[PDB]
């Protein structure tokens, strides 16, 4: 309706809005997307090869954890599919060994796969044979975060109102199950997301349907009370992201249709509220290359890119800090990931099976 018209305007202006737009329909939709950190740049080719961690979300068919390759200028193909029990709610690679991938399932167990220990072609028997099953939750969830300073320390958020932490660094070779090291119980509702700080090995944040942002210190013996509890939004908080250049700064996204900006030195007062989304926000992620650049996505089928440096600048298109609106998707966006090796390239995935790899025009970000 308005979707068809707004899509027509988008199509029309696409040649001026983008330096790259690649569109691919996956067999089944992916709920998750994350660029792997590796890139190969062949000497006798005009492209480089990047890889993505994806998943399936099926009805009445075998699900898989997926690694796909993407050719980017200086084609998209499925390289690996691993049998997965149920849809992949979220999949994230371990920074210290990106062959290790944790997944969230529609049941309580959190799974870990080392993809070098599985065939690239899945057995049609469909057995899910994860390297580890991580126990501690009672329900499925979404939030998942590996500690970049403590190898094998993984956080998980669950619809059971808890956050679990595992340390998988010293599991016996033939051990296949790991019990949670610590369970954090501060939230009073579904915990939607969790994320470690980039620098402080003991600091992580969580957000929940209780409308709160909580900041946790793993060195504390009290796992029921966070270091800070913040009334962050006027509705469910679905996501958070720490700024990788500015150690005190983070962002949260919410069902209240806003992204909030926070300073860890004064959490009692929101620094800023980014307003433009027309429905619930499910993902927020800072740019890996640019300190003032943040993106957000959700149910309004839009991915907004925000530039903090334009806050308060001197109309009807949106606020000055709204840099770009990506309107390529015509269904709810499930996840997205900034490419870590190619500035301004994003992969976003929507519920209608579409994956887009795109890059706004150079003249837009200067």
């Amino acid at each position: 309706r308005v979707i068809n018209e707004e899509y027509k305007i988008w199509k029309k202006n696409t040649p001026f809005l983008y330096d790259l737009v690649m569109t691919h329909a996956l067999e089944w939709p992916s709920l998750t997307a994350q660029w792997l950190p590796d890139v190969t740049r062949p000497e006798g080719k005009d492209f480089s090869i990047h890889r993505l961690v994806l998943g399936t979300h099926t009805s009445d068919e075998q699900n898989h954890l997926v690694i796909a390759s993407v050719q980017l200028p200086n084609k998209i193909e499925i390289e690996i599919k691993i049998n997965h029990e149920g849809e992949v709610n979220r999949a994230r690679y371990m920074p210290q060994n990106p062959c290790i991938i944790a997944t969230k399932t529609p049941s309580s167990d959190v799974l870990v796969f080392d993809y070098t220990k599985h065939p690239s072609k899945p057995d049609p028997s469909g057995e899910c044979n994860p390297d580890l099953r991580l126990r501690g939750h009672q329900k499925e969830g979404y939030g998942l975060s590996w500690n970049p300073n403590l190898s094998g320390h993984l956080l998980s958020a669950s619809d059971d109102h808890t956050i679990c932490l595992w340390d998988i660094s010293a599991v016996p070779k033939e051990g296949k199950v790991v019990d949670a090291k610590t369970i954090f119980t501060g939230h009073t509702a579904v915990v939607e997301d969790v994320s470690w700080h980039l620098l402080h090995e003991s600091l992580f944040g969580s957000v929940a349907d209780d409308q709160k942002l909580m900041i946790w210190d793993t060195r504390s013996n009290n796992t029921s009370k966070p270091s800070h509890s913040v009334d962050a939004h006027t509705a469910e908080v679905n996501c958070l992201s720490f700024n990788p250049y500015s150690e005190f700064i983070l962002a949260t996204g919410s069902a209240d249709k806003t992204v909030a900006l926070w300073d860890l030195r004064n959490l009692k007062l929101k620094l800023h509220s980014f307003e433009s989304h027309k429905d619930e926000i499910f993902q927020v992620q800072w740019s890996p290359h640019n300190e003032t650049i943040l993106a957000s996505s959700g149910t309004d089928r839009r991915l907004n890119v925000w530039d903090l440096s334009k806050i308060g600048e001197e109309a009807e298109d949106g606020p000055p800090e709204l840099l770009f609106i990506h309107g390529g998707h015509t269904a709810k966006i499930s996840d997205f990931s900034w490419n870590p090796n190619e500035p301004w390239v994003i992969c976003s995935v929507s519920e209608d099976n579409i994956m887009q790899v795109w890059q706004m025009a150079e003249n837009i970000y200067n």
Partner: peptide, 9 residues
């Protein structure tokens, strides 16, 4: 809930 009903291409 959060997830929709998926369909194959």
């Amino acid at each position: 809930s959060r997830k929709g009903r998926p369909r194959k291409t």
